[PDB]
């Protein structure tokens, strides 16, 4: 079905020329037929019809319908992968943004009044180069998108390496928040600063020996000035020529020694990296969540463009004469596809032929392959009208 | 025009396993040789370098860059020193557990000299 | 199977007949004179 | 059960294991050497280890190349052969099984390397209990399936080269040491059920039965992920496939394995793994590290049962690869990014 | 580009080592017994802007040329497949970067 599809309506693409009939119902239209022969008396029809293009021939119309597909897969994987990445960012939910009107109008009556209007969008151009251009803007929307989560990534891995900084166990940080001016002396070259985090069970073992551990030693500077949860912080002044004495009594007696020295500039370092990464993350989540918005807008308008031009290419390229089609969309409930897509194609398949034909309903994919997707360049079903299943 | 494809490396079995792993050379079928020579942590002799540099410096013609690292070209500065032709051409880079050495380049030498 | 290749991978754009032969099937396509590469 | 098995046998072998055991790297010491930058502060946490005694012997405060397999080569040869050596009956004849099965997947590729024509004078052991000059030249130097199946003959117990031999015979699974490796991983990811299924009257098992099916489903996989983008053949079985635990089907692995990229086996099969939607290498083999290594420090609080050896000598693997990486990347003044990911020991 | 060269081929040496030792296995015997073809290669080509001629060399990778038979082993596998991915990417800017010495 959908990756993104919770509690979205399904509604199903089909094309067929203007003097056809269906099988159950003879001397009938088609709006007729699909609006009181309905299954269940609640199908909703709406317009989705758009205006014909320039075509040079059936060459360029294969290759515009092969590129129109491929296109439409990858805006269709470009849509999903648009909604994920919203989905992630805990901004909607499973029953938001899938049934909620989108551009400011419902699915059914936006969908209903979708006749190939576009701000940026001709009428007299060809079709390749608006569908290489909606292909590549919701590319380009989405890789916006993605770069914009990667760099909110990596200000989540920056603010997660601050973190280790900031606080935890005594094996990589260093006191830079609880530093004062009668804790550690690094003003002169007689003086230093040595830490040395202790368990909580040789706290005395560390403060009786810690007179025994160097020589040239401070006393009364046997206080918990810093805390953590595996060790405690204890601060000794002594000689830099003690410190591999003092390194070796405190390893030989099962502590563990820290390396620090008095300056400003690390300290300083310390809390502006965390600082800057918390807020090039803050800032990287709210600009992350406006464009995988707009990206998701822009890429729902681009695959819903694109499916109007692959399904009029598809339907004109299938059908061939005439250039004209009656081209609806087909508002189906939830859990109701297989119902109208067996109708419809047990109904409509007698006009491609009776050797083509095949019962069918719903849409099942496939991680390994897509299937139910009408694919003209790839293996995969084939019906005898034109048929497209969207999931929203 | 185009005559060479392959890069000859000669270096520690760690950097000439991740070179022989990225696909710079191979061993050809025609000789059942290798156009790259491992070199052994006290293993390997000089002459065995100066043989490998030598054949793969003169002897083969699809060789388009010659790798060497600093120390293993300490010992073979003499012939890597007298070595001057940009076919196959010479590139000195660190080896592994080692800084750059400004006097284990054979260019910067002659570059050095009337610059 | 070559001619639901051929509908699933090109549409209604063919003839399907076949022919018996001598052992061998006669086949016959029309399509137009510009999709010879296709 | 408990309070009906009085084997002297694991109890000896629980106890000259534990005494090991008791002086090793825990996961605080693992957590605070992978946070420690400082070459006091890694050397003194890893020196409390049994892997510290030759650091202890010879001070160093950068971590060498050769000092972290000679080290790793005495310390798995200690951790190894001395307990193999001292243990007798069906604890050391099981547990002889277990580090020859380790040595099978190096002296395959050693047989296959020298029919391959490559050059071999060095081989450093993981956790094969015999040496690679007294068991390994022999079946390496042999060719033959006769000469293989009298050499695996005259060991005691056999060992499952014999399997692969005789399956490798017919020409059945593959010519090279990639499908004879997947192969021999499920015929011994068997035979660890085979196993634990054969000792469960006399000794109980609980935490075994949970870190083989969690160590069987992580190594299928890893075998299923490590024969991606590698040219795996769909025909031959190459992906490991095999019942384990109930929620990994043969077509779900093989096919998302092979071509598919369906990463749907991995979150149906659990929710509380690393990895059950993650599609990249990196954080699948960090994944796969912290789930194998889940379940060693849970299983060795019960005493009196081979569960605790089977977990702890498969937790020396990890262990000396994290060691090795820790020592490697603080000696070499770099940053971890293998071991900084896994949190999990 | 010789200093760049040299810390990337450090740092490369340094991961490829790491990740060798951290196999326990020679892998370099049987990555150059399983090595038999050339994965990347150059193409010489001559762009030359001056007095005389000069040597230019350009990176190319073959698209039929896959991964090397290599992984398979259990956890060495992945981490021989990412050391020889990463030696790759190391090993293709440590060539455009070295290629300038002629």
Redesign the interface.
Known sequence: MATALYTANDFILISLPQNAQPVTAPGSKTDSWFNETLIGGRAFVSDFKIPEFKIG???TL?VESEELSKVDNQIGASIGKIIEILQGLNETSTNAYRTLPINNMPVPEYLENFQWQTRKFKLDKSIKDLITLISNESSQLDADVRATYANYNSAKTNLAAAE?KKT??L???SLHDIVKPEDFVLNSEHLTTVLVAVPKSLKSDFEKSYETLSKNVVPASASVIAEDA?YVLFNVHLFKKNVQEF?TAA?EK?F????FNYSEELIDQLKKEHDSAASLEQSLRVQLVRLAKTAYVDVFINWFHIKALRVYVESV??Y?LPPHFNIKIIAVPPKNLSKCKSELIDAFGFL??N??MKDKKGKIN???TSLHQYA??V????E?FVMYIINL | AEKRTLIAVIADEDTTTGLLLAGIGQITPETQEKNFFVYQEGKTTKEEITDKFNHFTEERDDIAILLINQHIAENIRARVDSFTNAFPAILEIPSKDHPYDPEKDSVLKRVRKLF | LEQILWRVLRGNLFFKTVEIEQKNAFIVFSHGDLIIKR | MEGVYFNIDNGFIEGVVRGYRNGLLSNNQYINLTQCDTLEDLKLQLSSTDYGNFLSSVSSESLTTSLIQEYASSKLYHEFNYIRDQSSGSTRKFMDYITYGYMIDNVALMITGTIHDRDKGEILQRCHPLGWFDTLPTLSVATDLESLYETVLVDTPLAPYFKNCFDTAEELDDMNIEIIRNKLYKAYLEDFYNFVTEEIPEPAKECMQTLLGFEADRRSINIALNSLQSSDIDPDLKSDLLPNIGKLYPLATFHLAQAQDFEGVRAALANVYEYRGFLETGNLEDHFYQLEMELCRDAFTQQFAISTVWAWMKSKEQEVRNITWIAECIAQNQRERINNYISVY | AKQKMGRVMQTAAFSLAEVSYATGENIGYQVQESVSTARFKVRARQENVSGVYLSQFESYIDPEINDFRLTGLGRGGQQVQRAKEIYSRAVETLVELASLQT
């Open positions: 021939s059936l060459d294969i280790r935890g166990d094996s990589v940080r595996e390194t390893r099962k563990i020694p820290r390396e390229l299938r061939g491609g032929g050797a083509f496939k991680q390994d003209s360049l293996d995969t079903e084939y005898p």
